[PDB]
Write a protein that binds this ligand. Structure first.
Ligand SMILES: O=C1Cc2cc(Nc3ncnc(Cl)c3Cl)ccc2N1
Ligand SMILES: O=C1Cc2cc(Nc3ncnc(Cl)c3Cl)ccc2N1
Ligand SMILES: [Cl-]
Ligand SMILES: [Cl-]
Lengths: 4, 124, 124, 4
């Protein structure tokens, strides 16, 4: 999971 | 927004769509390319091809279970492009590049047409 | 094999599937979550959820046009997860995390359940 | 395009  | 994003989600979805295609699950159309038949999902074809996007948004063609392609379309070229639609992987070879590019132009798959043009240019 | 791969292909496909969902094109099921209704594509739901994968491979349920979820399922939690299925983006907030995690457990979306567990653990 |  990432900060887009 | 403040959303978080799962990096592999799109790839995992496409992988499962290809698994459903391989097991012939919820396929809703057969693409006829001369003597050859290819089962697929209309939504995936539309998501990958300007030609299929136009066909399946048509108020009569949207309901057809069989689509016949132009007789000049090569079945192997179509097969390679259908595999690409469902995997992101393109089996581009010296022996098939001309058929793949012509099929990609007909299907309106601009990124494929682009890499075919570049691979051909390098060999000239 | 000796295939080449188009990096953005899976993301571009998912983007177009979400555009077809937004315009209600070739959607083939309505998911009922108490008073709320959500239109979707069975193939995308199966590709994202262990629960929908089981439902739509069932020889009778595969043909249903309406699926009613358990009455304990929160419509907003479902909406957030349906948006995630079609975009890879999850709108996870303090005010919705409990409903999102419970809905993800029911829908069998293990990566979502995992990030919810981790976000909850950090707040304890 | 890349070599996967
Ligand atoms: O080279 C390409 C690949 C492609 C796909 C589609 N598909 C869609 N485009 C916009 N909205 C929607 Cl809803 C879809 Cl399905 C249309 C044109 C092209 N051209
Ligand atoms: O957390 C998750 C996400 C998910 C999706 C699916 N889907 C599929 N899996 C295998 N082959 C096929 Cl054909 C599909 Cl459609 C099944 C289980 C789970 N669990
Ligand atoms: Cl393309
Ligand atoms: Cl997930």
């Amino acid at each position: 999971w990432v900060i887009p | 927004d403040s959303c978080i994003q799962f990096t592999r989600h799109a790839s995992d979805v496409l992988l499962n769509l290809n698994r459903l295609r391989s097991r012939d699950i919820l396929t809703d159309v057969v693409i006829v390319v001369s003597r050859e038949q290819f089962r697929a999902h209309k939504t995936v074809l539309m998501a990958c091809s300007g030609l299929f996007y136009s066909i399946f948004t048509d108020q009569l063609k949207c309901n057809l279970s069989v689509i016949n392609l132009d007789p000049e379309i090569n079945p192997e070229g179509f097969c390679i492009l259908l595999d690409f639609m469902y995997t992101s992987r393109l089996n581009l070879r010296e022996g098939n590049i001309m058929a793949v590019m012509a099929t990609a132009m007909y299907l309106q798959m601009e990124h494929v047409v682009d890499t075919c043009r570049k691979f051909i240019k390098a060999s000239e």
